[PDB]
Structure 1
Amino acid sequence: KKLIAEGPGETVLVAEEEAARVALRKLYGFTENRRPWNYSKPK
């Protein structure tokens, strides 16, 4: 009973599949708002 992901869709099946993709992105630490890649010269 704890939300882990939520996804939109034109159909319930599409929305459910999108929610699974959102959950996978969070689990793998590959979210849209994750820390950007660091290109700073090593220091």
Structure 2
Amino acid sequence: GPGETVLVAEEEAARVALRKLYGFTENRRPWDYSKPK
């Protein structure tokens, strides 16, 4: 993760990990509205 200070950068890196653990990454598959079913 990036940050203005080392503590801020480390804190941001913690969020980058949690996003990739809960499968909420920015490039995750888009939500599916296609189904008529």
TM-score by length of 1: 0.80
- Per the normalisation by structure 2, the TM-score is 0.92
Q: Deviations over 1:1-43 (max 9, x none)?
A: xxxxxx0000000000000000000000000000000000335
The number of residues matched between the two structures is: 37
Q: Tell me, which stretches of 5 or more residues in structure 1 are unaligned?
A: 1-6
Q: Gaps (5+ residues) in structure 2?
A: none
- Residues of 2 paired with 1:30 and 1:42: CA distance? 25
Larger helix fraction of residues: 2
For residue 3 of structure 2, give the secondary structure of its aligned residue in structure 1.
coil
* RMSD (Å) for aligned C-alpha atoms: 1.0
Residue 22 (1) aligns with residue 21 (2): no
